[PDB]
Amino acid sequence: SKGEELFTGVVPILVELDGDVNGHKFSVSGEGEGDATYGKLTLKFICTTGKLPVPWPTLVTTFVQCFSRYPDHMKRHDFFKSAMPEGYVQERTIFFKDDGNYKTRAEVKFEGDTLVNRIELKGIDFKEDGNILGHKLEYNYNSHNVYIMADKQKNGIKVNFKIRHNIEDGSVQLADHYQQNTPIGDGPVLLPDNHYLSTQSALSKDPNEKRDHMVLLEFVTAAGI
Fold it and tell me: What keywords were assigned to this record?
């Protein structure tokens, strides 16, 4: 396919987010690199408007699936890379159990040789005293499976999954994800058979960094075929 060749080495990544959660406005910038050969991502995010109003972990999923490692035998199912360099639109709705929801819209594509993820986030109906606004989530992250399916009507894919956020009291915060991706260009893309992505992520901090930020290491590989 098209994009395949674009991912053959380490690619620099730029992440830009504009958000509003219950009237609290904020901006985030992130930079790093991805190496789809190992399904590996390394990023650092910085809250540019000051203190992040929600917990960092809640934004992970929002902050580039084209960096997933697809095994040789599954290359024909890699929609993400097939949409490059023109890119794709990724939209979601994220429902926090017994809490508010996030609505996101992003464009992911290449600007020169940098892979760009530009997002607009809108959060509503959050409880001022819930796990999100109340900042009760631990600073860590779990492994998940992300289910993918073809959408022949929109020439895209539909994706669904649940994230499990650990709460400081030992409990769990569920986050139901509903997602749609559609190509930006008019060129051909690869529509996949049902399959899934297996994820793992580690969160850390930069000891010498005074701004509000998050350091992220993540591995993702496709499976189920």
Answer: Chromophore, Luminescence, Photoprotein
| CA pair distance 68, 203, nearest whole angstrom | 18
User: Which structure tokens are listed for 43?
Assistant: 């990023």
Cα dihedral angle (113, 12, 44, 183), rounded to 10 degrees? 60
181: CB partners within 8 A, 6+ apart: 79, 80, 83, 88, 89, 90, 91, 156, 157, 159
CA distances from 162 to 29, 38, 95, 165, 171 (A): 25, 24, 9, 10, 16
CA atoms within 13 A on the CB side of 154: 17
CATH number of 1-225: 2.40.155.10
* Spatial contact of 48 and 29, defined as CB atoms under 8 Å apart: yes
The coordinates were experimentally obtained by X-ray
